[PDB]
């Protein structure tokens, strides 16, 4: 069909449209700094020349929003995140439960495990929220968020229990400003009414 | 309620460059107060340093439309169906610049868009266990009928396609996983929570 014209044939291109020529690990410690060399299709029709990009590689994470549907409360975990220091009033952040996903593990298994270990919470039902790329211009990291049913009365890390409304107001005010928690709590603000009905049936 | 400790309670002893390239990886060495009442020992953490960004959600309040930009993000490759992503206009904030200056410049360079009024959405840490990066999101008033075509600086090997969707369509794409990068998810969830008042404010 080479005589067929271009017009006779969401996003435009797939993995068939990129060639990763080479990968190198330039730094290996707890995390890695990798270098990708690749060429890719251009929107105008041609192929790019070879492009090189640095990629921060630290694996991928499972995240759990602990929500008590009886009490309309969320459980937050506080701990120091030194990387926040230079742009934040304090490096101690209020966050969701989270942990790295190891080979062959599922998001749900990690989320449930971490909820018990960080916050001492037994999780009942879970539902997916969303899975997102934290900052794909520079890091490969993907984080997959679930909401988990908890009894908030049963709640170096410190555990905080607050109303959903307070937690969301802290997002609005900038007092909760890490991506995983912002995404989870915005989702909860959009979905809590149906979720509470589903989980208190 | 709220957090327990402040910058009075942590000392950064030193920082060491582990990798110096286009971006950097630094080792922070620090000590900090513990919730149990003591002081930690010396802690180290590897931190990815890549500066900070301004992000623009281009929203047409008359048409209830959103402008997205499509381009390859190779880091997405290993965990995504395709490394081409649908994203918000964005760019790095250089020394002395304002978030608005960058957002307006990138809106023109990445999408061919002039911007009218602007309002903050939220400023967030992308992944603060391992990177310092902060991204500050604005919503910008645009005429989505002027958003079309292929943009980006060809010299910088930047190849960007503009897409226009309705707001409801963009949000549906978030729900379905077709838009799954933090900046766009945060911006579009915010828009779902605020569009009624924002359209009223900008169509008066
Ligand atoms: N050499 C080099 N340039 C980069 C890298 N990441 C981004 N850039 C440059 O940053 C600009 C676009 O960055 P973006 O906003 O798409 O993340 C282009 O000038 C591009 O060449 C990298 O890892 N290495
Ligand atoms: N112990 C330690 N872990 C580090 C360092 N830099 C990065 N990490 C990573 O951070 C992980 C702990 O993350 P956290 O549990 O604090 O969210 C470690 O398991 C390790 O992979 C470092 O200097 N020391
Ligand atoms: Mg740009």
PDB file of N, CA, C and O in Angstrom, chain A residues 36-83:
ATOM      1  N   UNK A  36      20.314   7.049  28.625  1.00  0.00           N
ATOM      2  CA  UNK A  36      19.643   6.408  27.505  1.00  0.00           C
ATOM      3  C   UNK A  36      20.067   7.109  26.217  1.00  0.00           C
ATOM      4  O   UNK A  36      20.057   8.342  26.149  1.00  0.00           O
ATOM      5  N   UNK A  37      20.401   6.330  25.189  1.00  0.00           N
ATOM      6  CA  UNK A  37      20.624   6.848  23.848  1.00  0.00           C
ATOM      7  C   UNK A  37      19.567   6.253  22.929  1.00  0.00           C
ATOM      8  O   UNK A  37      19.371   5.037  22.914  1.00  0.00           O
ATOM      9  N   UNK A  38      18.887   7.103  22.164  1.00  0.00           N
ATOM     10  CA  UNK A  38      17.733   6.628  21.413  1.00  0.00           C
ATOM     11  C   UNK A  38      17.454   7.536  20.227  1.00  0.00           C
ATOM     12  O   UNK A  38      17.910   8.678  20.167  1.00  0.00           O
ATOM     13  N   UNK A  39      16.686   7.005  19.283  1.00  0.00           N
ATOM     14  CA  UNK A  39      16.110   7.798  18.207  1.00  0.00           C
ATOM     15  C   UNK A  39      14.617   7.509  18.137  1.00  0.00           C
ATOM     16  O   UNK A  39      14.158   6.442  18.552  1.00  0.00           O
ATOM     17  N   UNK A  40      13.853   8.474  17.633  1.00  0.00           N
ATOM     18  CA  UNK A  40      12.404   8.338  17.669  1.00  0.00           C
ATOM     19  C   UNK A  40      11.764   9.026  16.477  1.00  0.00           C
ATOM     20  O   UNK A  40      12.314   9.960  15.894  1.00  0.00           O
ATOM     21  N   UNK A  41      10.570   8.552  16.138  1.00  0.00           N
ATOM     22  CA  UNK A  41       9.778   9.175  15.089  1.00  0.00           C
ATOM     23  C   UNK A  41       9.422  10.613  15.454  1.00  0.00           C
ATOM     24  O   UNK A  41       9.196  10.946  16.625  1.00  0.00           O
ATOM     25  N   UNK A  42       9.388  11.469  14.433  1.00  0.00           N
ATOM     26  CA  UNK A  42       8.989  12.862  14.551  1.00  0.00           C
ATOM     27  C   UNK A  42       7.575  13.027  14.006  1.00  0.00           C
ATOM     28  O   UNK A  42       7.162  12.324  13.075  1.00  0.00           O
ATOM     29  N   UNK A  43       6.843  13.990  14.571  1.00  0.00           N
ATOM     30  CA  UNK A  43       5.467  14.226  14.139  1.00  0.00           C
ATOM     31  C   UNK A  43       5.369  14.563  12.652  1.00  0.00           C
ATOM     32  O   UNK A  43       4.331  14.295  12.034  1.00  0.00           O
ATOM     33  N   UNK A  44       6.416  15.157  12.071  1.00  0.00           N
ATOM     34  CA  UNK A  44       6.434  15.495  10.651  1.00  0.00           C
ATOM     35  C   UNK A  44       6.666  14.293   9.745  1.00  0.00           C
ATOM     36  O   UNK A  44       6.511  14.426   8.528  1.00  0.00           O
ATOM     37  N   UNK A  45       7.055  13.140  10.289  1.00  0.00           N
ATOM     38  CA  UNK A  45       7.203  11.951   9.465  1.00  0.00           C
ATOM     39  C   UNK A  45       8.556  11.268   9.532  1.00  0.00           C
ATOM     40  O   UNK A  45       8.648  10.046   9.371  1.00  0.00           O
ATOM     41  N   UNK A  46       9.614  12.031   9.767  1.00  0.00           N
ATOM     42  CA  UNK A  46      10.951  11.481   9.753  1.00  0.00           C
ATOM     43  C   UNK A  46      11.341  10.827  11.067  1.00  0.00           C
ATOM     44  O   UNK A  46      10.524  10.572  11.955  1.00  0.00           O
ATOM     45  N   UNK A  47      12.628  10.533  11.173  1.00  0.00           N
ATOM     46  CA  UNK A  47      13.206   9.978  12.386  1.00  0.00           C
ATOM     47  C   UNK A  47      14.198  10.979  12.952  1.00  0.00           C
ATOM     48  O   UNK A  47      14.909  11.656  12.203  1.00  0.00           O
ATOM     49  N   UNK A  48      14.252  11.069  14.276  1.00  0.00           N
ATOM     50  CA  UNK A  48      15.220  11.950  14.889  1.00  0.00           C
ATOM     51  C   UNK A  48      16.626  11.376  14.715  1.00  0.00           C
ATOM     52  O   UNK A  48      16.817  10.207  14.363  1.00  0.00           O
ATOM     53  N   UNK A  49      17.620  12.216  14.971  1.00  0.00           N
ATOM     54  CA  UNK A  49      18.963  11.733  15.197  1.00  0.00           C
ATOM     55  C   UNK A  49      19.038  11.114  16.580  1.00  0.00           C
ATOM     56  O   UNK A  49      18.049  11.015  17.306  1.00  0.00           O
ATOM     57  N   UNK A  50      20.236  10.676  16.947  1.00  0.00           N
ATOM     58  CA  UNK A  50      20.414  10.045  18.248  1.00  0.00           C
ATOM     59  C   UNK A  50      20.360  11.088  19.360  1.00  0.00           C
ATOM     60  O   UNK A  50      21.034  12.121  19.300  1.00  0.00           O
ATOM     61  N   UNK A  51      19.556  10.807  20.378  1.00  0.00           N
ATOM     62  CA  UNK A  51      19.339  11.700  21.508  1.00  0.00           C
ATOM     63  C   UNK A  51      19.849  10.979  22.744  1.00  0.00           C
ATOM     64  O   UNK A  51      19.711   9.755  22.850  1.00  0.00           O
ATOM     65  N   UNK A  52      20.428  11.730  23.680  1.00  0.00           N
ATOM     66  CA  UNK A  52      20.900  11.183  24.945  1.00  0.00           C
ATOM     67  C   UNK A  52      20.207  11.905  26.091  1.00  0.00           C
ATOM     68  O   UNK A  52      20.099  13.137  26.082  1.00  0.00           O
ATOM     69  N   UNK A  53      19.738  11.137  27.071  1.00  0.00           N
ATOM     70  CA  UNK A  53      19.057  11.680  28.239  1.00  0.00           C
ATOM     71  C   UNK A  53      19.513  10.947  29.492  1.00  0.00           C
ATOM     72  O   UNK A  53      19.646   9.720  29.493  1.00  0.00           O
ATOM     73  N   UNK A  54      19.746  11.715  30.556  1.00  0.00           N
ATOM     74  CA  UNK A  54      19.998  11.163  31.881  1.00  0.00           C
ATOM     75  C   UNK A  54      18.671  10.822  32.531  1.00  0.00           C
ATOM     76  O   UNK A  54      17.703  11.572  32.407  1.00  0.00           O
ATOM     77  N   UNK A  55      18.633   9.685  33.225  1.00  0.00           N
ATOM     78  CA  UNK A  55      17.417   9.183  33.853  1.00  0.00           C
ATOM     79  C   UNK A  55      17.754   8.763  35.282  1.00  0.00           C
ATOM     80  O   UNK A  55      18.612   7.901  35.499  1.00  0.00           O
ATOM     81  N   UNK A  56      17.066   9.345  36.254  1.00  0.00           N
ATOM     82  CA  UNK A  56      17.193   8.926  37.646  1.00  0.00           C
ATOM     83  C   UNK A  56      16.343   7.675  37.850  1.00  0.00           C
ATOM     84  O   UNK A  56      15.131   7.702  37.647  1.00  0.00           O
ATOM     85  N   UNK A  57      16.989   6.584  38.267  1.00  0.00           N
ATOM     86  CA  UNK A  57      16.352   5.276  38.371  1.00  0.00           C
ATOM     87  C   UNK A  57      16.370   4.827  39.825  1.00  0.00           C
ATOM     88  O   UNK A  57      17.441   4.635  40.415  1.00  0.00           O
ATOM     89  N   UNK A  58      15.190   4.651  40.399  1.00  0.00           N
ATOM     90  CA  UNK A  58      15.084   4.259  41.800  1.00  0.00           C
ATOM     91  C   UNK A  58      13.994   3.208  42.008  1.00  0.00           C
ATOM     92  O   UNK A  58      13.490   3.058  43.129  1.00  0.00           O
ATOM     93  N   UNK A  59      13.611   2.492  40.969  1.00  0.00           N
ATOM     94  CA  UNK A  59      12.518   1.558  41.087  1.00  0.00           C
ATOM     95  C   UNK A  59      11.190   2.297  41.195  1.00  0.00           C
ATOM     96  O   UNK A  59      11.068   3.498  40.935  1.00  0.00           O
ATOM     97  N   UNK A  60      10.181   1.537  41.616  1.00  0.00           N
ATOM     98  CA  UNK A  60       8.780   1.951  41.564  1.00  0.00           C
ATOM     99  C   UNK A  60       8.110   1.604  42.878  1.00  0.00           C
ATOM    100  O   UNK A  60       8.595   0.768  43.643  1.00  0.00           O
ATOM    101  N   UNK A  61       7.003   2.285  43.153  1.00  0.00           N
ATOM    102  CA  UNK A  61       6.432   2.294  44.489  1.00  0.00           C
ATOM    103  C   UNK A  61       4.953   1.960  44.488  1.00  0.00           C
ATOM    104  O   UNK A  61       4.244   2.170  43.503  1.00  0.00           O
ATOM    105  N   UNK A  62       4.508   1.409  45.616  1.00  0.00           N
ATOM    106  CA  UNK A  62       3.100   1.252  45.948  1.00  0.00           C
ATOM    107  C   UNK A  62       2.766   2.263  47.035  1.00  0.00           C
ATOM    108  O   UNK A  62       3.561   2.476  47.960  1.00  0.00           O
ATOM    109  N   UNK A  63       1.594   2.882  46.922  1.00  0.00           N
ATOM    110  CA  UNK A  63       1.163   3.941  47.828  1.00  0.00           C
ATOM    111  C   UNK A  63      -0.227   3.597  48.328  1.00  0.00           C
ATOM    112  O   UNK A  63      -1.066   3.118  47.558  1.00  0.00           O
ATOM    113  N   UNK A  64      -0.479   3.826  49.616  1.00  0.00           N
ATOM    114  CA  UNK A  64      -1.792   3.546  50.187  1.00  0.00           C
ATOM    115  C   UNK A  64      -2.328   4.764  50.919  1.00  0.00           C
ATOM    116  O   UNK A  64      -1.663   5.300  51.817  1.00  0.00           O
ATOM    117  N   UNK A  65      -3.520   5.203  50.511  1.00  0.00           N
ATOM    118  CA  UNK A  65      -4.290   6.202  51.236  1.00  0.00           C
ATOM    119  C   UNK A  65      -5.136   5.471  52.264  1.00  0.00           C
ATOM    120  O   UNK A  65      -6.065   4.750  51.877  1.00  0.00           O
ATOM    121  N   UNK A  66      -4.844   5.593  53.568  1.00  0.00           N
ATOM    122  CA  UNK A  66      -5.680   4.913  54.568  1.00  0.00           C
ATOM    123  C   UNK A  66      -6.891   5.772  54.876  1.00  0.00           C
ATOM    124  O   UNK A  66      -6.765   6.878  55.407  1.00  0.00           O
ATOM    125  N   UNK A  67      -8.078   5.280  54.508  1.00  0.00           N
ATOM    126  CA  UNK A  67      -9.330   6.008  54.671  1.00  0.00           C
ATOM    127  C   UNK A  67     -10.276   5.215  55.557  1.00  0.00           C
ATOM    128  O   UNK A  67     -10.523   4.030  55.305  1.00  0.00           O
ATOM    129  N   UNK A  68     -10.826   5.880  56.576  1.00  0.00           N
ATOM    130  CA  UNK A  68     -11.833   5.278  57.436  1.00  0.00           C
ATOM    131  C   UNK A  68     -13.195   5.776  56.985  1.00  0.00           C
ATOM    132  O   UNK A  68     -13.520   6.952  57.200  1.00  0.00           O
ATOM    133  N   UNK A  69     -14.013   4.943  56.336  1.00  0.00           N
ATOM    134  CA  UNK A  69     -15.268   5.455  55.779  1.00  0.00           C
ATOM    135  C   UNK A  69     -16.344   5.667  56.824  1.00  0.00           C
ATOM    136  O   UNK A  69     -17.310   6.390  56.561  1.00  0.00           O
ATOM    137  N   UNK A  70     -16.221   5.024  57.986  1.00  0.00           N
ATOM    138  CA  UNK A  70     -17.178   5.252  59.062  1.00  0.00           C
ATOM    139  C   UNK A  70     -16.990   6.642  59.647  1.00  0.00           C
ATOM    140  O   UNK A  70     -17.962   7.361  59.922  1.00  0.00           O
ATOM    141  N   UNK A  71     -15.736   7.037  59.847  1.00  0.00           N
ATOM    142  CA  UNK A  71     -15.389   8.273  60.531  1.00  0.00           C
ATOM    143  C   UNK A  71     -15.070   9.415  59.581  1.00  0.00           C
ATOM    144  O   UNK A  71     -14.892  10.550  60.040  1.00  0.00           O
ATOM    145  N   UNK A  72     -14.973   9.146  58.279  1.00  0.00           N
ATOM    146  CA  UNK A  72     -14.561  10.142  57.291  1.00  0.00           C
ATOM    147  C   UNK A  72     -13.215  10.748  57.689  1.00  0.00           C
ATOM    148  O   UNK A  72     -13.032  11.968  57.730  1.00  0.00           O
ATOM    149  N   UNK A  73     -12.259   9.865  57.994  1.00  0.00           N
ATOM    150  CA  UNK A  73     -10.933  10.259  58.436  1.00  0.00           C
ATOM    151  C   UNK A  73      -9.866   9.599  57.576  1.00  0.00           C
ATOM    152  O   UNK A  73     -10.080   8.553  56.964  1.00  0.00           O
ATOM    153  N   UNK A  74      -8.704  10.248  57.541  1.00  0.00           N
ATOM    154  CA  UNK A  74      -7.536   9.703  56.874  1.00  0.00           C
ATOM    155  C   UNK A  74      -6.404   9.628  57.879  1.00  0.00           C
ATOM    156  O   UNK A  74      -6.346  10.382  58.860  1.00  0.00           O
ATOM    157  N   UNK A  75      -5.516   8.667  57.649  1.00  0.00           N
ATOM    158  CA  UNK A  75      -4.324   8.477  58.466  1.00  0.00           C
ATOM    159  C   UNK A  75      -3.123   8.924  57.640  1.00  0.00           C
ATOM    160  O   UNK A  75      -2.918   8.456  56.513  1.00  0.00           O
ATOM    161  N   UNK A  76      -2.345   9.845  58.189  1.00  0.00           N
ATOM    162  CA  UNK A  76      -1.154  10.388  57.566  1.00  0.00           C
ATOM    163  C   UNK A  76       0.058   9.946  58.370  1.00  0.00           C
ATOM    164  O   UNK A  76      -0.029   9.728  59.579  1.00  0.00           O
ATOM    165  N   UNK A  77       1.188   9.786  57.687  1.00  0.00           N
ATOM    166  CA  UNK A  77       2.447   9.452  58.351  1.00  0.00           C
ATOM    167  C   UNK A  77       3.409  10.617  58.173  1.00  0.00           C
ATOM    168  O   UNK A  77       3.543  11.159  57.071  1.00  0.00           O
ATOM    169  N   UNK A  78       4.062  11.014  59.255  1.00  0.00           N
ATOM    170  CA  UNK A  78       5.015  12.106  59.243  1.00  0.00           C
ATOM    171  C   UNK A  78       6.420  11.545  59.379  1.00  0.00           C
ATOM    172  O   UNK A  78       6.683  10.720  60.264  1.00  0.00           O
ATOM    173  N   UNK A  79       7.320  11.998  58.511  1.00  0.00           N
ATOM    174  CA  UNK A  79       8.736  11.673  58.646  1.00  0.00           C
ATOM    175  C   UNK A  79       9.558  12.692  57.875  1.00  0.00           C
ATOM    176  O   UNK A  79       9.039  13.432  57.031  1.00  0.00           O
ATOM    177  N   UNK A  80      10.849  12.737  58.176  1.00  0.00           N
ATOM    178  CA  UNK A  80      11.717  13.709  57.524  1.00  0.00           C
ATOM    179  C   UNK A  80      12.052  13.243  56.115  1.00  0.00           C
ATOM    180  O   UNK A  80      12.354  12.068  55.879  1.00  0.00           O
ATOM    181  N   UNK A  81      11.982  14.169  55.164  1.00  0.00           N
ATOM    182  CA  UNK A  81      12.379  13.947  53.770  1.00  0.00           C
ATOM    183  C   UNK A  81      13.348  15.089  53.468  1.00  0.00           C
ATOM    184  O   UNK A  81      12.929  16.195  53.107  1.00  0.00           O
ATOM    185  N   UNK A  82      14.643  14.829  53.633  1.00  0.00           N
ATOM    186  CA  UNK A  82      15.622  15.909  53.576  1.00  0.00           C
ATOM    187  C   UNK A  82      15.624  16.625  52.228  1.00  0.00           C
ATOM    188  O   UNK A  82      15.942  17.816  52.159  1.00  0.00           O
ATOM    189  N   UNK A  83      15.243  15.945  51.146  1.00  0.00           N
ATOM    190  CA  UNK A  83      15.222  16.595  49.843  1.00  0.00           C
ATOM    191  C   UNK A  83      14.225  17.746  49.780  1.00  0.00           C
ATOM    192  O   UNK A  83      14.338  18.597  48.894  1.00  0.00           O
TER     193      UNK A  83
END
